[PDB]
């Protein structure tokens, strides 16, 4: 079938099949380690737990192990396809738990559509798990199953499909009512859809203060009125209204809030006209919402809008709810997830939306936190903890809350969140600038890697790409690769660009005494690399990305000739290694073969200032094959480099010469060279020659199991980066994210002066 | 209680428990999640809905085993409960991952009733590729297993029932082969009616024993046909028509005793009256029915197996389930039938009757050791073959070499490289009459060195010789409380008999390099110089230094004393132990800026070492460039590769190239298919000391791979200098490989 589907298929099938693997968190390499992990040593925890059962939480994974359980009768938007065919989404859901709350998950697909047998099978699994996440079970069975297992089991039971939308949209409505000066007891709500999510929406809205009579529920047969027989059951009567309205159009007349849990296009302009002033629209249907935010505001300008789409503001995404909720539950070793806790989550999210460089402004286009916000865990998980204890369902009290947030941050390290946060920041930047995306030029307009990355990139609003090349030939490669998301992208052929000759004049004037006269300037300016560099220089672009298809020197050279270094700056490649507790910055990985002490120092200063952009204390090591010897050669160079750097930046920890492990490992430093002023391990590593840097970062990238992003060109006046030609597509995507950042930053600085 | 306390903290420290579920694929970024979850995840779903079998292609199913228990028969603690059994189930899981690379969900079920238990497990089938029932008390377990085996279409296997049967079965085959018995005539009595017994009888009969020649006993005595007292459906399976009623009566003239019982049950009288060449399987835990020394005291002709590791012929289940399930899953089988269990038995037995060299088949080696790295490669394919032949397989394995490759991928260097080294050292010693390698450690007062030596002498790795003032070294040894080193030889250099002969030698070597006799004497008083000379003159087999001194100062007296072999160059070499492969990095320590020629020779040295471990070396000359050959190191590395290829035309040697280009074959094929390096490189030669040194140290710290070394190559005798940043575990590894280098050199010298 399609391209994206094929990618997903290969994603699941390549290497190890599936998306999860169960590994040891403790040593198990030697026979002794196994004598502790298994017999005869493993008897010790058992004996303990046998005598004091609660201690299962102390000696086993339970305190962080959640079950994602399903019979696959309501998978995503695919319906009743079976448990086995539902296994990939349950593995996926597990991944969300791990990435957002650091929770371990076993995905359990049960072959039981009978409620009775499903519950009998699951109930009895309780000793194994810290909590149960029911997922993708069709209505009305899911209601019966969750209600039953919620009490029969002494660990939390939570069907996300029912309550996620209710919780998140609950927060969104709290804030929207606050903006429009509504009080909920008077708010008239209409819910369209009778799936698993609808009932929980009405209940949560009432828990927040809305009145039942002011809420009207609809399904495929229309308004769910009291006394209806056609297509009803026990649970659809739970919120049947005694309203006179019978069609969807009639329920929404003079209405305040629309909660759409149905089908695309279901909400019509006629319906919109007859809502109350400042109508609140939740169009949560999948794959397309009941109406797009643009159509809704087109019909009625005072509207407030939320979707399940990330393309549009106010995305309600279930990922805002279950990770923090289960987190709070597990850390308090709670017996359930009750209404007090769900409400605690609702309010925590809502409050979070209502409160470095830029930040999202609270308003009609910002009603709830963004999914890639690292603070949701920090804010929500503890309020859930608090609510669990206050309700008495917690069995373990949390006393030190700061210490608790430390424990939560540890769960959210750079290997999980750095890129996520970068992307968010790009979004805060564009949003805070009236929404324009940075204009980024790609001189390699026919590069397969580049076009494929741009698909991802344009879809997620990271930049506005401009491609360079012959328009017919690039439109052709784009069609051959079947990437339709790029039919709008600007394509420019340099020689026929209107600003071409002014560009050549500029290059000429810049390099007329460096071997480039008008003839030659014209020649060079016809080259996309040069044209791109000049667009960036002249402000016709906010940044540029090249080198996907040629060696670094050739790609970087026009950048250095056109844009040049800023005062005292030095052109230098820099990469991030995204580890779990920290990230390391490596420089210079691309430009300088054999930098002097002076040059190494400046590189250090540049990397340092970048690290600071990310709110980290840079701690710098000048790497060598030597430990504090200062011997003739590389040792003296790196020692002097550290000395110079410290003189220009006396506030920073900068040390050298030292070996790499001495540098990154603080115990080694304290045990062997405690006189060193570098403490806590360095996070910035500058190399003595191009061999060491280029080789190190590439090896780490290939055989280490840590993401590394870059190289990023530092030292230059305007925004430009040269990819490693060995890059992957996902690599280019990460690169362009950070180029979008650099571009946004530099544009901001230019607009100040 | 101290071992107990250690185990407790082991479980309590860091993350509670012993397991965590991690992603095997990228899933941090927006794109990655759009593939791991909605909307991309719809694609595999839609596929599986269409063809349920594809659940094996797009999910962990084909490598996921449930270790399921209710905690009614946990280890040797009995009916202790589901929550209390959780630690051993996680543990069992760790064993699955380590011995077969199988992922496991530990499932502790709160159900003592057979019908509800079975109803809960039956319905989990879509989740797992197989079910390993564990620690469920008899007789429930019998009913449960038979039932779920019928009801479920994925393999069902209660290891407690069949493990001892299978392993001791292999053992019995071999023991009978040594003693020239045919199974048809062998008289067996098995003592104990636990979960293990019936399956023992069943497997023995499958191997050729007659039901009539087998007697079962429990606490009340012989299980005869027509006995009523305390019998049940399953104790009837092997009721004998024997006239014997006591155990002692059954064992009279018997060939085999299978003890699945209690300590002391086998007595000299019943033992005296077993047949000639009695076979004793004393597998009670914690203590055997009888110790091997006492059984041989009573009957010298006895062959003995225990469940304990202290003694030869250990019967341990860990030899069974990992390959059994491996074979099962890889053929995507619907069950584990008797045919497969037998395949396991026969393969285990054959493997024992066959690293560089191995053990001697006889009465003290009837089966492989539990930690034999050959087991998975040997057993899993025979299980698979049996699975296919018996029709329970749903996916045929076509290429057996491709399959053994895949199993090697599962049991890669990160799990077994050091293990195999240790085994190889042991077998070298063993094949050479038990002499341990003489390794001299000049830093006799180094705490890190002493701590490593504890493990080293404990594990029969070498004969250490410490250097320093005997007083101060014993003083520190007592201070650190390491009692295993009260026997170790300690030498004060100037007080050694061969001291002056050593100084003369140094003199004659360096009399024209700035050293006359006085100076020679003076230097030879230095432990580093003394150690070097000791190794040189053969008064030691090797040396390891550099724990408390910088590398240059440590390595210099070695190079001045022992020196390089012809055409050789001193070079530091490291291994990176990854999961699919190991990488070799050189030269990581000595040469600041090796020439092309030097880089070539370094390459050759690394190559020969890799070949020593049975790998095809593939060499990349690293640069900041891809096949540019520009002035500078690119040119140097291109030339280096050309020279290497000239000296070893049979090898894949290529350059100049970047590191990702080198280790990654896709990059290479995508960008530089003209190159002669195919399949990724495993030997990486660096253009300078900065790059090599920084690389191995960085990888070691932030990478998640063990890195071992540096090892000094190019020198005439076995000597290595540690990185001063080494940890103690680092020193034990280093000394392992030093022992190997030492053994090898001694062997070639005797030629
Ligand atoms: C991602 C990867 O895999 S990276 C691959 C490994 N790295 C490489 O292949 C690149 C290695 N380095 C080089 O090739 C060279 O140092 C280059 C290309 C960066 C310099 O280019 P050269 O051909 O030597 O001189 P060139 O005229 O092109 O210099 C470019 C411009 O920037 C300036 N410039 C170049 N390098 C520097 C530097 N370290 N510091 C300050 N200014 C510099 C120059 O002055 C020049 O501007 P100007 O001539 O108008 O004054
Ligand atoms: C694990 C880690 O962290 S390593 C840290 C980084 N590595 C280092 O710091 C060591 C840096 N390298 C060096 O300092 C030098 O290369 C050393 C120590 C290897 C040798 O340096 P020198 O001071 O010249 O040694 P020295 O002059 O005493 O001679 C060494 C002996 O070995 C020989 N030798 C030394 N290097 C070599 C070589 N690459 N090739 C062949 N022979 C050599 C010499 O012939 C000499 O013997 P000779 O006296 O008969 O001529």
Numbering used by the authors:
A (entry chain F): 15 to 369, 380 to 777
B (entry chain E): 16 to 369, 380 to 776
Provide text from the study:
Bacterial hybrid malic enzymes (MaeB grouping, multidomain) catalyse the transformation of malate to pyruvate, and are a major contributor to cellular reducing power and carbon flux. The PTA domain is homologous to PTA enzymes (that interconvert acetyl-CoA and phosphate to CoA and acetyl phosphate), yet they appear to lack critical catalytic residues and thus acts as a sensor instead.
Full-length MaeBbound retains the architectures observed for the isolated structures, placing the ME dimer twofold axis immediately below that of the PTA d2:d2 dimer axis. The resultant hexamer forms a disc measuring ~100 × 175 × 195 Å, with the ME domains twisted with respect to the triangular PTA edge. The individual ME and PTA domains are linked by two α-helices, the first, referred to here as L1, composed of a region unique to hybrid MEs (residues 422–437), and the second, L2, formed from the first α-helix of the PTA fold (residues 438–457). The relative orientation of the ME and PTA domains results in very few contacts between the two—L1 packs against the ME core via several conserved hydrophobic residues and L2 is ampipathic, with a hydrophobic N-terminus interacting with the PTA d1:d2 interface, and a polar C-terminus partly solvent-exposed. Interestingly, residue F386 at the base of the hook is an equivalent position to human ME residue L507, which has been shown to be involved in the conversion to the closed catalytically active state. It is likely that our inhibited MaeBbound structure represents an inactive state by both disordering the local hook structure and limiting the dynamics of d1.
